[PDB]
Amino acid sequence: NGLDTNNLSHQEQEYLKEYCDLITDLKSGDLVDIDLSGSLVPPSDVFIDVRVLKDAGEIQTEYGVFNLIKDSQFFVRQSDVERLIQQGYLQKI
Amino acid sequence: SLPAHLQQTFSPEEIQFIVENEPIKIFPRITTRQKIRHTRWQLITTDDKALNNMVAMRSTEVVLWIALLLKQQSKCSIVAPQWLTTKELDRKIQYEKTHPDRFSELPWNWLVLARILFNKAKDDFHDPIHELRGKIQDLREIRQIKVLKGLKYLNESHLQLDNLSLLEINELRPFITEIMDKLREIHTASLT
Amino acid sequence: KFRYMPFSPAGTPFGFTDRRYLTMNEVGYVSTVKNSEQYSITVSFFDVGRFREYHFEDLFGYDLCFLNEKGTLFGQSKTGQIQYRPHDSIHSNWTKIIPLQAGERITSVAATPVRVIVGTSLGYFRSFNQFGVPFAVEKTSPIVALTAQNYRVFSVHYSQFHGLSYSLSELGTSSKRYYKRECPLPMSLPNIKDANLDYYNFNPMGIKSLFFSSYGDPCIFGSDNTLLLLSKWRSPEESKWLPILDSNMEIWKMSGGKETTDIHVWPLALAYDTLNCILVKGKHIWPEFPLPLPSEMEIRMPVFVKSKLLEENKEIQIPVSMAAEEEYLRSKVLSELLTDTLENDGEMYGNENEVLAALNGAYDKALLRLFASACSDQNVEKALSLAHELKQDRALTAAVKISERAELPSLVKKINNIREARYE
Amino acid sequence: MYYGISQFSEAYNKILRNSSSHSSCQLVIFVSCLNIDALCATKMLSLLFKKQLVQSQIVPIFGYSELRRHYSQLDDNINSLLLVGFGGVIDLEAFLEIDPQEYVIDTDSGEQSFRRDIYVLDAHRPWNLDNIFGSQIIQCFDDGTVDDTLGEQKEAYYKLLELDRKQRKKQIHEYEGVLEEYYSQGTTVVNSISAQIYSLLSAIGETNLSNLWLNILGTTSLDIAYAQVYNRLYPLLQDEVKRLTPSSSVKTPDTLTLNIQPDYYLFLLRHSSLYDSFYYSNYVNAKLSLWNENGKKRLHKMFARMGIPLSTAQETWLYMDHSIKRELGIIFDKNLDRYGLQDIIRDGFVRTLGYRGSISASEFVEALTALLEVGNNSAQKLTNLRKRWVSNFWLSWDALDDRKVELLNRGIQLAQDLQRAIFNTGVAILEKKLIKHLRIYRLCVLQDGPDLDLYRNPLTLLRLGNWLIECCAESEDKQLLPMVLASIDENTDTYLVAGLTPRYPRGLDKKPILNNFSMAFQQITAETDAKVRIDNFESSIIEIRREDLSPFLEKLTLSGLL
Amino acid sequence: NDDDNTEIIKSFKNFILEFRLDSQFIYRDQLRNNILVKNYSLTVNMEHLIGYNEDIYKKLSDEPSDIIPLFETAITQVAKRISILSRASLPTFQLILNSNANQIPLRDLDSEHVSKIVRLSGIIISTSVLSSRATYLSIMCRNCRHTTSITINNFNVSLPRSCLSNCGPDPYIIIHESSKFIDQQFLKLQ
Amino acid sequence: ELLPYPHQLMKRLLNRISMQSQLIENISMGFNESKLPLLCMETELERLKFVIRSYIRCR
Ligand SMILES: [Zn+2]
């Protein structure tokens, strides 16, 4: 969630919600250049090949506009699509 | 917040990062040198003077992630160290077979650097890769036999090794630390 | 009698293989492959960013090549077929057949920014420009080796009735000055089993390579595996050939004293205090097609005797006395070379003045280490001769302190008299 | 005409001048999926752009409508487009509604520049004259047929466009007759995309063993129906193999070698038994007629004559006794002349590395073709099915890597099973005589059979088609005729119709025959109200309804453009 | 003939020590992980041995009964190289083969396949009791009371007639205290 | 044990990473094409961000 509601209690739901507000408050203000909910793997490969799993439309990135056509290959940086790998819409290496 | 498999130890890719952050001798295949008649490099975690003074077909010293990044470009070829030769590895094998109680005087990053240069520099070795990897595997196996022999001396007080590699520290860290922690817990409960 | 063979710098023979290197230098390497009565020539460059490597299908059978930073000159020895190919592919390639008599072969070729030089086995010396217009037909002693760097041309001549010699010239876009013309060359030709005879049937002169340094000083690598540099070539009354690497001795030195045969040095270039060269392992001197990384060999002045190094070592560890001696001699000759190149041609970068200052520092540090070994044997006169060659006034006080530690007050008085001469 | 071979390098430089930017992605490569040549071509292009760091988006496209959908949703930031394996026949301005007025930037001086470059890597030799000549935006990587053949059409088109009574009619109708003679011409291939991209790599200087092996695979994949192309491109591959080979040795785990050695014209020799390799080969069944029982008797008799026992012949090639397989060339030379199988002797390229076994180019391209084929309200079914073959194409792309040999072995097993199905359906066609003679073309309609759900795939129907053309080509009693091959899909309820060109027997050694089905398909689609699909990149692949099949074939046999 | 035997042992030693597929020595790691769980055995794929050297494949497949003990000796030598430090025990190992060959049926098993490696399939109907075969035998002479050793490999040997010191016609007995034994289970295949 | 915080070191590191962020964005506005120093900046920034992220996440 930083980068299924039946099983939790209402007190656990509000615990999870307020913890989500805390962890989205942590990366604001100070510690803002990094992301605290980011990837814990080191970026030992600056560019990766990325394969699209599911069709997710046209998305934007920092300085360019990406497509999410299903079953397509990108040769892009790990940090540009690292969050999208975490969502699972992109999955390769 | 931290995952359970990264709680009390380093993952091997963090060890890869740590040994990617060292200097290494290298041969540039591009000329970035300003003549008497191009944005500068300008890095903040390493000395950029050796990278600003990058001369083709010379020996320079750059950090290893730059080395691998430029080897991917093939704009610059990584030079193996002195201990990555057949003769020096045979000398290390002879030292391992000579003194059974003591580990050889190998660098701390001898398994991780060897793996990095085997998977990234397949045409940068003066000696053949074949017997180099064979001697690497032989040294790894005899060091495994020596740490298996030394693990019989799991003491409650302390335990010492001389020249164990960082990757072998992550090999043996959770087992040794947990077993000695429980031995110390047993003896401290045994105290009056 | 004697047979001439076509020579290109650091070329390799065919051997039992079907391919060889036409030429190898600091710019790149040109190799040819036998391709069922034709050839395929691949030109690769060590500078990937400046030059892009290429290859082409050669139907004439070129056995000569010269590779510089602005073109590539191929030459067929038996028919006189030469070709010049610019790298940028803006200027067009040109192809020319020169007249060859019966028994005449092109022995060596060279290229210049404004000229193209072809040398034949009967002594002809044909100079074109870069576009194919002929400019000169000279007759000299038979040129068996050519290497040009920028506007400087260096050549080696040999004949039965003239002997071995060299010629150095600077032709330029202007100021046509010839430095030396057919002055004799101090090099030992090889003593004329099949591992050496496969090469000496191909290269009878024993020239492994012929090049210029990074600062423009000529260098030659003969059959005795020594690198000879020509020092003070701009002044013909002070020119001398300095051996700066007896590479068999350093090969024996890194091997721990073992008389080693299976490793050889194949020279490519000389940067300042460093020869870039592939250490070829095996029974063959020449490297093969999977070319390894060229190793670096620091130049050492040949003052190493094997007897003393074997005597003290009962890795060969040099004692500090003769290490100081070789550091002093190497620092002196390199200081002379850097001073001449900085005074005459100027600095091509910004690093030359500071490395000259550090080189004079290493000069004085080696002289003080010789001064210490002189003072340890109560040798006042040798200590005075050693500190008389001390260059800077900074390091003379160190000699005063060593004289104080050795208790030689007359040496203190004479060094202070030297200082008194040095204040004005 | 816009790019001859000597300036392919220049075109690549232009790509860098539009795409060598670290901040944004600006290069999108449209690849025709379901083609081995485009797959190898895009693999070499992806390796080249990975070595120089160009951002890329590789998009596999099946249909023409799929192309129009993908190009319509493209962002305006993209300035470089590469069309691999297609886009050389249709008019891309008339198809992608391209008007140069809204794409032009900085026209000022006779200079014109655009904000998007669309490059075409197409092997289909009918070239659209507007596309190759009158188009600045659409840039073609021509092999060189424009400088030798297409000059009269160049001048006819140029004086057609330049000049917008008896003199005007006399020259304009003559030039339009020349242009309409060049049009309505059949489709043929004389060069591969992999050869052109390897020529570009030779011009740049990024050639190595991997790109050479991919070029070898791309050239070898055209050996089924375009053997003149492979016979033309073979000496260049031989020169490149002998150029980039090392000096020499002992088998060691790291030395990849790629030899020119006898690689016989067999289906999966080194990964199956010798009996199954002769039994499932198209050429062996083409000559000895293995579909009936007499051909199997003759195959067993020649196994008796060759001295190979059937216990040894049915054993796996890797476990085969090498007293059979070492002197198999001598046995082939001595015994195959009496049975007519002299053309089995063929030198090919065999690559091995380490101790994991040797692979030929032919076995590798049949493995890749099998991984394209069976690698893994009706409009939703067609969309899901197109997504399935795009996933199959990316699985076959995954099989091209060196570290994924398990995908290659899965492709080998899939090729064996698919060839078993192709053999069963081929003898099903041949036994009951569904091949009908229609005096201008030969008709074969599959109404029902074993595992008919494999034939909704295009390349599986082309495999069955090449099986039938090889089997009927050696029978000289019936002459050369084009073939219509229709297969029914019950759930979609459509007849997928393939047009197959005949060919001469392989032993003979001229002018290649053309593909005259696209002209008739287009003219019948224009004249009649048949609801048909023309969207396939191979224009001989159409989809008709079941109820409109017989009128389509009657209008086909009435038309004289076959 | 012992030169060829030790050449075979050294060659299969080099096959174990030098085999590497996808940057991995599979057989050295297999032997180490088999020693670490005290499972003194090595499973060898036939495809891997063919891809290493087909000459070794014919040496294995021609007369297997005379060369499989040599391969056992090579495996034990590799194991003593790997898991035993020198100048500072392990019994004999077992070579277990994996083959992907076509399955020879029981009715086609005949006199042609005698002393050849065959792969077959069937149904087990009876497994017998484990019997104790012997490998190391401490053989004692009854008269001169000297003890020799006989090493037994379970392929294709008996008590010899000379005591190797008249001493006696058949002067040997077996000492069962210093003898090493392995298991042998009889099966019936349908 | 939770180690003491190096306040001055981390304040200097955030100031340095901020100055490098404005430097790389200014050079991106400034965008011969030698993109390898920019790539060195880019992987420099993300590897420093990884080290800072992992240290703060562990503590
Ligand atoms: Zn006895």
Would you kindly provide a written description of the structure presented here, covering whatever features stand out?
The structure is cut from a larger assembly and holds chains A (93 residues), B (192 residues), C (424 residues), D (562 residues), E (190 residues) and F (59 residues). Chain A is an alpha+beta fold and 93 residues long. Chain A has helices at 10-26, 82-87, and strands spanning 47-51, 57-60, 65-68, 73-77. The longest helix of chain A has 17 residues, at 10-26. The two termini of chain B are 39 Å apart. Chain B has seven helices and three strands. Chain B is mainly alpha-helical. Chain C is of the alpha+beta class. Chain C has two domains: 2-303, no CATH class; 304-424, no CATH class. In chain C, a hairpin with a 5-residue loop joins strand 6 (71-75) and strand 7. In chain C, helix 4 runs antiparallel to helix 5 (352-376) and helix 5 runs parallel beside helix 7 (396-406). Chain C is elongated. Helices cover 32% and strands 26% of the residues of chain E. In chain E, helix 1 (2-18) crosses helix 5, helix 2 packs across helix 5 (68-83) and helix 3 (46-52) packs across helix 4 (54-62). The interface between A and F is medium-sized, with 16 and 17 residues. The structure holds zinc ion. Zinc ion binds at residues 141, 143-144, 163, 165, 167, 171 of chain E. Chain F: Component of the GINS complex which is a heterotetramer composed of SLD5, PSF1, PSF2 and PSF3. Interacts with PSF2. Chain F: Keywords: DNA replication, Nucleus. Chain F: Belongs to the GINS4/SLD5 family. Chain F: This is DNA replication complex GINS protein SLD5.
In short:
Chain B has 192 residues and is mostly helical. Chain B has 7 helices and 3 strands. Chain A: Component of the GINS complex which is a heterotetramer of SLD5, PSF1, PSF2 and PSF3. Interacts with PSF2.
